[PDB]
Copies of this chain bind each other. A is one copy, B any other.
Amino acid sequence: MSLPDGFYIRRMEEGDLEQVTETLKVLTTVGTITPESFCKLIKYWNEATVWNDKKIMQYNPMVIVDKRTETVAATGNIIIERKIIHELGLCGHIEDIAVNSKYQGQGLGKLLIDQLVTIGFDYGCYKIILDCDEKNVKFYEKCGFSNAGVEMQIRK
Contacts and interface: CB of A to CB of B under 8 A. Distances in A.
By CB atoms of chain B within 10 A, which of A38, A43, A125, A129 has the most?
A129
Contact of A33 (B21, B24, B84): B84
B156 A152 contact: no
Given A93-B81, A150-B134, A150-B150, A33 B87 contact: yes
A1 interface: no
A9 interface: no
Contacts of A91: 95
Task: Count identical subunits in the complex.
Answer: 2
Contact of A82 (B41, B133, B144, B145): B41
B88 A37 contact: yes
Interface string A74-88: 000001011111111
Chain A's interface size range is 35 or more
Interface string A51-95: 101000010010000000000000000010111111110010101
Contact of A85 (B29, B130, B141): B29
A105 interface: no
19 contacts: A24-B85, A30-B86, A31-B87, A33-B84, A33-B88, A38-B84, A44-B50, A48-B48, A124-B156, A128-B154, A128-B155, A130-B151, A131-B131, A131-B151, A132-B149, A133-B149, A143-B154, A145-B153, A148-B152
